[PDB]
Amino acid sequence: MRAVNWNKKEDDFSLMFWKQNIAQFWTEEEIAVSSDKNTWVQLSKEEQIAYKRVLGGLTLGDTKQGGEGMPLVLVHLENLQAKSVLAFMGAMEEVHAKSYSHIFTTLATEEEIDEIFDWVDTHPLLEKKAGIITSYYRRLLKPEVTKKELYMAMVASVFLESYLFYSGFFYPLYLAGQGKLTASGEIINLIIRDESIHGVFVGILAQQIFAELSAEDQQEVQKETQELLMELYEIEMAYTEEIYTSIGLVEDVNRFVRYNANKGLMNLGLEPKFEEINPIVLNGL
């Protein structure tokens, strides 16, 4: 039975991503959030509700990535150095999720926080979203999995990290780019800096598995990938309408979703499927 030997490369990229993930390490206590109170109170009820709802959605994403996606992808990898990177990423997913609670503690009361997490748990669209993603992970709860199933779990992971999350990062970046909630915005940037290299690395692993598949299996997962992409897109369009109508940003957010879906596709080595970033969001980055 093999132990991980870092003095013999198993691939050309794992050491680089290991070092980078380590270099980027951070935790919530680093960023103080209290000074955001001064711009929080200037927002409207509907804006505050939107912000709280998108942050609850982001927490759910990271909860599922740290507690389901990374563990079940990594346990079936044969490459022990890549496993190590994915284990570290999974731990950072939990740092992300905890950092949203740190923001909430400054911006909401205990009763309001419970209202957020109750709303997250019962929201039909969030349930549908996460349910579709996690169903690819649940296929991996058996002793022998096919490479098609592992490929598609990696596709689902890239789509969550690089794509389905970003309907949620839009609003924190949009406010930070206007100089509102900028401390919370520095936390979201740290998170994004992690998610970016997460999606890149899982996408590299996906392309390596893909190249081992037979031609018939390649055609089957390409079809499933394109379908999943547009299935999630449909649901996200419904989610964005529900969250952002009240504050006039539905069509901006949808443009941000399409941009990030294209990024996700490219992390997988695939061509873009939708035809620039909102300039205020760009300033928040």
- Binding residues for a copy of itself, rule: CB under 8 A, are 1-8, 18, 22, 25, 27, 56, 59-60, 62-64, 66-68, 70-72, 74-75, 77, 80, 83-84, 87-88, 90-95, 97-98, 101-102, 104-105, 110, 113-114, 117, 120-121, 126-127, 130-131, 134, 138, 141-143
Give, as ranges, the residues between 160 and 179 that touch Fe ion (CB under 5 A): 161
Which residue number places its CB atom closest to Fe ion? 198
Exactly one of 51, 100, 166, 174 is catalytic; which is it?
Answer: 100
Q: In the bound complex, what is the minimum distance in angstroms from residue 131's beta carbon to Mn ion?
A: 18
- Write out 78-129 in H/E/C secondary structure: CCHHHHHHHHHHHHHHHHHHHHHHHHHHHHCCHHHHHHHHHHHHHCHHHHHH
The reply to whether 258 sits near Fe ion by the rule CB under 5 A is no
Please return the burial class of 29, using the count of CB atoms within 10 Å of its CB with bins 0-12, 13-18 and 19+. Answer: exposed
Q: Which amino acid is at 179?
A: G
Q: In the bound complex, what is the minimum distance in angstroms from residue 216's beta carbon to Fe ion?
A: 31
Nearest to 58 by CA among 187, 245, 249: 187
Q: Rounded to whole angstroms, what are the CA distances from 164 to 53, 143, 192, 196?
A: 15, 29, 13, 13
Annotated binding site for Fe(2+): 62, 93, 96, 161, 195, 198
**Interacting span for Mn ion (CB under 5 A) from 65-73, 79-87, 109-117, 180-188:** 65-73
Tell me whether residue 102 or residue 180 sits nearer to a copy of itself (CB atom). Answer: 102
Annotated binding site: 62, 93, 96, 161, 195, 198
Tell me whether residue 147 or residue 273 sits nearer to a copy of itself (CB atom). Answer: 147
The reply to whether 68 sits near Fe ion by the rule CB under 5 A is no
- Of 28, 36, 62, 68, which one interacts with Mn ion (CB under 5 A)? 62
Q: In the bound complex, what is the minimum distance in angstroms from residue 103's beta carbon to Mn ion?
A: 15
The reply to whether 93 sits near Mn ion by the rule CB under 5 A is yes
DSSP string, 144-187: S--HHHHHHHHHHHHHIIIIITHHHHHHHHHHHTTTSSHHHHHH
> For the chain, give me the number of helices (H) and strands (E)?
13, 0
Q: In the bound complex, what is the minimum distance in angstroms from residue 11's beta carbon to a copy of itself?
A: 15
**Going by C-beta distance under 8 Å and a sequence separation of 6 or more, which residues neighbour residue 270?**
225
Q: Residue 61 in contact with residue 132, Cβ under 8 Å?
A: no
Give, as ranges, the residues between 5 and 34 that touch Mn ion (CB under 5 A): none
100 tagged catalytic: yes
The reply to whether 64 sits near Fe ion by the rule CB under 5 A is no
Q: Rounded to whole angstroms, what are the CA distances from 181 to 7, 37, 83?
A: 45, 8, 36
Q: In the bound complex, what is the minimum distance in angstroms from residue 7's beta carbon to Fe ion?
A: 22
Contact residues for Fe ion, defined by CB under 5 A: 161, 195, 198
Catalytic residues: 100
